[PDB]
Scaffold this active site. Structure first.
Site, short mmCIF file in Angstrom:
data_model
loop_
_atom_site.label_atom_id
_atom_site.label_comp_id
_atom_site.label_asym_id
_atom_site.label_seq_id
_atom_site.Cartn_x
_atom_site.Cartn_y
_atom_site.Cartn_z
N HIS A 67 25.98 -9.72 12.36
CA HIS A 67 24.46 -9.53 11.91
C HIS A 67 24.17 -10.64 10.93
O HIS A 67 25.51 -10.15 9.25
CB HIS A 67 23.95 -7.97 11.40
CG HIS A 67 22.24 -8.38 11.23
ND1 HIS A 67 21.87 -8.54 9.67
CD2 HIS A 67 21.71 -7.58 11.74
CE1 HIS A 67 20.64 -8.44 9.40
NE2 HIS A 67 20.22 -8.00 10.93
N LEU A 70 19.79 -14.65 10.96
CA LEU A 70 18.43 -14.76 11.67
C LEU A 70 18.47 -12.91 12.54
O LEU A 70 17.74 -12.36 13.49
CB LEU A 70 18.89 -15.83 13.40
CG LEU A 70 17.89 -16.57 12.52
CD1 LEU A 70 19.10 -18.09 13.14
CD2 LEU A 70 16.81 -17.30 12.75
N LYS A 89 22.67 -14.83 20.61
CA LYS A 89 22.00 -15.05 19.11
C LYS A 89 20.85 -15.33 19.55
O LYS A 89 20.01 -16.63 20.45
CB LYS A 89 22.61 -16.21 18.26
CG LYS A 89 21.69 -16.56 16.48
CD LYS A 89 23.01 -16.70 15.37
CE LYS A 89 23.32 -18.39 15.35
NZ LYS A 89 21.71 -18.87 14.90
N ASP A 184 26.15 -27.03 8.19
CA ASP A 184 26.58 -26.03 7.36
C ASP A 184 27.85 -25.60 7.23
O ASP A 184 28.21 -24.95 7.35
CB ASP A 184 25.73 -25.03 8.08
CG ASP A 184 25.14 -23.97 7.35
OD1 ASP A 184 25.14 -23.82 6.03
OD2 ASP A 184 25.22 -23.08 7.65
N1 LIG Z 1 30.22 -17.17 18.81
C1 LIG Z 1 31.51 -16.83 18.21
O1 LIG Z 1 31.88 -15.75 18.91
C2 LIG Z 1 30.81 -16.02 16.94
C3 LIG Z 1 31.26 -15.22 16.49
N2 LIG Z 1 32.36 -14.30 16.50
C4 LIG Z 1 30.53 -14.87 15.30
C5 LIG Z 1 30.60 -14.17 13.91
O2 LIG Z 1 29.81 -14.02 12.82
C6 LIG Z 1 31.81 -12.81 14.08
C7 LIG Z 1 32.40 -12.85 13.30
C8 LIG Z 1 34.02 -11.67 13.23
C9 LIG Z 1 33.52 -10.93 14.19
F1 LIG Z 1 34.65 -9.87 14.60
C10 LIG Z 1 32.52 -10.73 15.41
C11 LIG Z 1 31.50 -11.92 15.64
N3 LIG Z 1 29.18 -15.59 15.07
C12 LIG Z 1 28.45 -15.93 14.48
C13 LIG Z 1 26.79 -16.33 14.50
C14 LIG Z 1 27.02 -17.37 15.88
C15 LIG Z 1 27.93 -17.36 16.79
C16 LIG Z 1 29.46 -16.11 16.30
NA NA Z 2 23.47 -20.10 8.55
#
Ligand SMILES: NC(=O)c1c(N)c(C(=O)c2ccc(F)cc2)n2ccccc12
Ligand code: NA
Ligand SMILES: [Fe+3]
Ligand code: NA
Length: 312
Positions: A67, A70, A89, A184
């Site tokens: 989370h 957005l 997302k 970013d």
């Molecule tokens: N495109 C992804 O794979 C992806 C992603 N892994 C994350 C994380 O914030 C996150 C981090 C550790 C985790 F264990 C699980 C999720 N994320 C956040 C925003 C957009 C894409 C993604």
């Molecule tokens: Na950001």
């Protein structure tokens, strides 16, 4: 039991972490959705897609993985591409049917961004939620791993951090090469997988001299971005900041990192040339910074060599 459950997280935002997106105030303190008492902005901390839901008849949702800015990040199987996991997302906190449709067009160009060290965007899709309202989702590569986000007691040795950003700079060069900036850059946005590093958040990506200035996280944003807009120079600045945030003990104010450096930092007395590179990178004057990511990369290569040497 099931291996996918492990990649995923409980789909509730704990009250601690619940804030308004428009004002930062701790809303939901206990309605999960509604309007912020203090700014009138709508909010929801509930997942907008649920396990079993199938988006655009292609993406079967399995639940949530994180989370953020957005809202929720969903994990889905792509029933075209051999049920490989992908990430969904959202695009905007709210809009009408037109706004969502517009939001996707504003972001449609990200398709073309292709580099081994950047998340691949696969697709942009509409989902008609339970209320007949259409919601835009970006479909992107599921990169399994952790972010380089290091807090105070877990700062990376300089050699390691340099190694990471040397893997990242090429990706910036690439973007720059096609007329784009990744506005970013910060530890939280670089993912270390069992193979490689990837940049994950493309919500700030823009064209050079793209409209406005609402590009990227304060404490990392270059000071001049209001007047200049996003430039190679403002990207270079984020790099210096990112390196700083990984390796140094940075003070905060109101959760944001302070501008400048703790000018008497142990690490910085130690690695003379790293300190000089940091300083060059985050120079208030955009013109004093490295003119190109390739240039910065080349000089930072030197500094790695110097850092390893001094490590004994
Ligand atoms: N495109 C992804 O794979 C992806 C992603 N892994 C994350 C994380 O914030 C996150 C981090 C550790 C985790 F264990 C699980 C999720 N994320 C956040 C925003 C957009 C894409 C993604
Ligand atoms: Na950001
Ligand atoms: Fe608010
Ligand atoms: Na920038």
């Amino acid at each position: 039991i099931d291996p996918l459950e492990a990649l995923m997280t409980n789909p509730v935002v704990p009250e601690s972490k619940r804030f308004c997106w428009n004002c930062g105030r701790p809303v939901g303190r206990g309605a999960s959705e509604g309007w912020c008492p203090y700014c009138g902005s709508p909010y929801s901390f509930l997942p907008q897609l649920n396990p079993g839901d199938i988006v655009a008849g292609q993406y079967e949702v399995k639940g949530c993985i994180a989370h953020g800015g957005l809202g929720w990040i969903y994990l889905a199987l792509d029933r075209n591409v051999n049920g490989r996991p992908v990430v969904l997302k959202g695009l905007v906190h709210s809009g009408d049917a037109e706004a969502q449709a517009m939001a996707m067009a504003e972001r449609q160009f990200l398709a073309e961004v292709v580099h081994p060290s950047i998340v691949q965007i696969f697709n942009f899709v509409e989902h008609t939620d339970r209320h007949g309202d259409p919601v835009g989702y970006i479909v992107m590569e599921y990169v399994g791993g952790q972010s380089l986000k290091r807090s105070k007691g877990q700062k990376l040795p300089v050699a390691e951090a340099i190694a990471y950003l040397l893997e990242i700079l090429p990706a910036l060069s690439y973007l720059h090469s096609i007329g784009l900036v990744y506005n970013d850059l910060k530890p939280e946005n670089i993912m270390l997988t069992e193979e490689q590093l990837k940049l994950i958040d493309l919500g700030a990506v823009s064209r050079i001299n793209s409209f406005g200035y609402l590009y990227g996280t304060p404490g990392f944003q270059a000071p001049e971005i209001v007047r200049t807009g996003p430039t190679v120079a403002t990207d270079i600045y984020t790099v210096g900041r990112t390196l700083a945030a990984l390796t140094l003990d940075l003070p905060t104010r109101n959760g944001r990192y302070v501008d400048g450096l703790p000018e008497d930092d142990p690490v910085l007395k130690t690695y003379d040339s790293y300190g000089r590179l940091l300083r060059r990178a985050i120079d208030p004057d955009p013109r004093q910074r490295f003119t190109t990511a390739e240039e910065m990369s080349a000089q930072l290569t030197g500094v790695l060599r110097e850092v390893v040497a001094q490590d004994t």
